[PDB]
Symmetry: D2
Subunit: 329 residues, 4 copies
């Protein structure tokens, strides 16, 4: 394939580090070697995260098109919109953000801390609620040229390139390390993160080793979006092969009870990971994929001796909108 | 000088990046070139920050002594205690944190968001006392250390901000060195450094590190304590102790320790309108966030210094972003509309 | 019957006013005349409410027994514990409250505003279960040299817990005398049960026990219905009800308690807003908003005979509104 | 004088009760007998309070004038605005509130709990910052606005309510068989104490009305009370001039600023709540409660005096200062 055909706008410090989770691995029996790739520490732009890796490939187009405003959308504690607000500021572009409450949740400071607080400080015009279209038009009607960034960058022609590159990066680091990882655990909701990885690893025959962990609580739909985006993306990078449904793995056992709400297992995994490795995860995304990986290692689902690369996508700031649950740890 | 004599436990990703603040530099007139060295992005351990650079030199001792618990102290939104808590978990050590409201402030969620929330999730024993308790007076610090022993553990004592500790200033001497190595990879030199100062060993380490090449008075400290006299004295003292510790064959002069006092108001922990405007300006031009307590104050200082033409034209100023952003969560009302 | 046999310690201003809800009645068509009796305005003790009417008949025993501490219990935003804390302070007694997280709700300031905030200011020892509490609480008092008067949840499951509301019916009769007519029905929110229990007994006296339409807010209908029926019969015996409480005497509509105790549904919110906007009378998302929702739907469904006169008992609970701030951020 | 000349629209349950504060009185020495007239329990309209007694004299005018929308203004945790919203709904009138950031206080839920929360639930259009703007906004919208200034105070009828309060107290002193020697009342916008001064000037006790400033700008507050007392004395036919000696305003307990409590404020709120079960707030009543307690403690009240504390309301604002009371 050929990812290099598309220009990448640098928004990250460079490749993200891989760290061993020796303590957590030993805690769970030492029969499986866990590692984490820190996408959550990839940028100095408001904490970054996977979304920022996705955006490096959308910005060249936004600039080429002469757009002067980044417009996006997400739930109240969306990580995507906060990263988009930080990139706009950094790029010298205006920013319009359509925030909808996508979660059946109602904490007192939900719309004033964490991600959305940062977006307002970063200068974004945060509009709390046709939602999407009205925003885009309003920009034109005001004399601007908006660049449309769909939820999570996922349903965008370029939204899948960022993680095809992740696979690339991983091969290079694997070479450096002198070994390869057997599986990759990643949280999936809108889909272009796992889709990019599916494609990038298809290139070396490990697509079905990318273990997605649904956090949408609507697996069928999510599973479909990953499959779709992947096929489209694989076509755009000239993957010498078509992506099959068998290339897509999405575990649905840890998404409950709803998108945006943690279950007791989610909280326990967040606590265990934090307390054994000093690495925080959130109750919406990463805590769910962390919960999945921990559970997998525990049920002996990984063969003894495997090397699992947990992709930490970010999300930590949302912790602030869930303060009551964590009041005592 | 010889910092290499002291072992350093890795708690960071390695050297921290320097980035140009081109948009902000331009917005202010383009006369001064501003950059930021991102200490705020130095670690995977709960956002890390400057305190984490300091801890790298204390942990080897804690480990050699066979300590199984890290004990520290700080205000409700202390960044230090949050870093201590993550480093502890990472090392397989317990952690006890003595905390109290050290600010004349009282936001509804102050003790349940940001830094302290993370410390609890990280598994620390967060002993937050009610107002009027006065830990510093009852010396709750020592009682916590005793209770660890009492419970059969061996505590490693880490003072406020890590500063007033024999090894507390080594991390930032390392900073000056690192900066020298990057100035070489880059091919040019930084003329000044702007750093926020409260407990002092950050700026102290820098002073010792940069005196080694005649640039100590180029470290422009910006007080965030609102108690300049004490702070300046603490920095000076720590610098001299550290200088001697690393074999800096030179005295630290009063002239080597620079601490501006114009941006600390109105009190430790409380931002002024300038602080807020600085935070917003920097955030909106560079996508780089700063906080109402520490960095927003040193950002405000740097911006104001440039605006008043206090920097010689053409100067390259290296803003040291020490971290602290998680504390914004405790000041939500103030930023409710941006 | 003879309620007068049991002493009553003055904790309220006196009989509670009945106010017509003309705007709401008219807004709903005008076929049913809606009224509200203001139990929520019955006292100067931290806003009072239905529980403080119940407490007037329990305090004399507590004083009689020489107790020096009132101990009670309830959820985080419990109205009961707040009234207990205020009543205790007013009587010169200490107070210990066991508060447990009884609602699947997580709001950042849930344990720091409203009812619980007041209890702390009132001087109560507010003990939050982790995250046996009750007996440790009582014993802690004994161990301290004091003597506790145990007040169960909502003052309900206690020998005297049904008396307050028997008198409520007594009050309504005296007011109907001045009004020249009798209310056709009474709407009351029910959870621990002794409020509706006293009313059932109180109105059974003049054959209207079945006119007391309880609205379940517990989301555990069966249990609640049983607790009312049981507490009713016991109270009936305690006063002298010259009749027996039949299973047909206890009415409890289960349609408005959803989704769970302590959580409002969309109808609950509409009801709160409608009533507050047409009458300037506030209700809460846990209790009164649910009974209000019931009455409005009842009227709207033509379940009340045209021309009926319905007495909505407003039991209080408004301070809990503070624990649901996000839901009402825009009204 | 004659207040009866002016119509009053019933917004309250009727005369407010007076209660003995025996426990508190005993705690402070037993030398001074303290009571509380509960204006905070005067109405079914979202807790009411002193502002509600005022509004009873302004509503008739609004109605006569055929107004359809009540417009008022106040700080974020304003009690006045919440009462106007309640009265409004009750009268079937629209309501527009100009809520300003009048306090140097930063709390995460300050604009979402307590008084303002109620105003929104009550259907009022709550605008966060303008006065003239909102009024015009109403007209331009096709409605007729009735303007209610901050605290109902600087208004022709704004002083009538509390003249009535002195009337009520006289009638109750008659039933009790004794008279109070002083009244303690918290003052900020002024017409509450003004009405009292005029009401009690009638029987020679205007100077026994002891106002405690909570504005932290005693100068302006004292002048507003005086000016309003004069206009109001004229309106009611008081046959005397209001002298500066008739306006007592203690400045010692207002600190550090309007809307912010001091430690004495907090101590006072706790003491009163813990001895009587009567709550007070950190902006208004807690400050007047603090004042009364201190006065007693200093022996400033002659032994044997009966002091009627006027509890103006304000408790819901407690929700905006949650952190301060987290441990009691
Ligand atoms: C968006 C997001 C995800 C899920 O990524 P998708 O590409 O939308 O499936 C996981 N974790 C975090 C922290 C995110 O922001
Ligand atoms: C501790 C701290 C400072 C000040 O450093 P000192 O060594 O205590 O003077 C500045 N910024 C942040 C974010 C900090 O945590
Ligand atoms: C306790 C309570 C109820 C229900 O009364 P029970 O006697 O427990 O059935 C209803 N409303 C409010 C405001 C309450 O506090
Ligand atoms: C408005 C108010 C005051 C002060 O009354 P003024 O007539 O404005 O002097 C005191 N207490 C409370 C609770 C108030 O709402």
């Amino acid at each position: 394939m050929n990812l290099q055909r598309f220009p990448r706008y640098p928004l990250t410090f460079g490749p993200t580090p891989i760290q061993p989770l020796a303590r957590l691995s030993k805690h769970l029996g030492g029969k499986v070697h866990l590692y984490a790739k820190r996408e959550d520490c990839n940028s100095g732009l408001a904490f970054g995260g996977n979304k920022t890796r996705k955006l490096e490939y959308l910005i060249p187009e936004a600039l080429a098109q002469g757009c002067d405003t980044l417009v996006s959308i997400g739930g109240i504690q969306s990580n995507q919109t906060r990263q988009v607000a930080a990139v706009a500021a950094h790029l010298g572009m205006k920013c319009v953000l359509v925030q909808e409450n996508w979660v059946n949740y109602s904490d007192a400071v939900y719309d004033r801390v964490g991600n959305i607080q940062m977006s307002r400080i970063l200068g974004a015009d945060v509009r709390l609620v046709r939602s999407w279209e009205d925003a885009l038009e309003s920009v034109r009607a005001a004399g601007g040229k908006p660049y449309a960034i769909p939820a999570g960058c996922s349903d965008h022609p370029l939204g899948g390139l960022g993680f095809v590159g992740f696979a690339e990066e991983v091969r290079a680091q694997e070479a450096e390390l002198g070994f390869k990882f057997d599986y990759v655990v990643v949280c999936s909701v809108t889909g272009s993160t796992q889709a990019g990885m599916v494609v990038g690893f298809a290139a070396d025959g490990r697509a079905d080793r990318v273990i997605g962990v649904d956090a949408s609580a609507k697996p069928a739909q999510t599973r479909e979006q990953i499959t779709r985006i992947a096929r489209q993306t694989a076509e755009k990078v000239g993957l010498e092969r078509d992506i099959m449904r068998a290339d897509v793995v999405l575990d649905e056992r840890f998404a409950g009870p709803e998108y945006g709400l943690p279950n007791e297992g989610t909280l326990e995994a967040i606590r265990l990971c934090a307390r054994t490795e000093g690495m925080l995860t959130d109750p919406v995304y990463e805590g769910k994929s962390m919960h999945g990986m921990i559970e997998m290692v525990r049920n002996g689902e990984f063969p003894e001796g495997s090397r699992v690369l947990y992709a930490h996508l970010g999300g930590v700031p949302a912790l602030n909108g869930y303060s009551f649950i964590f009041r005592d740890g």
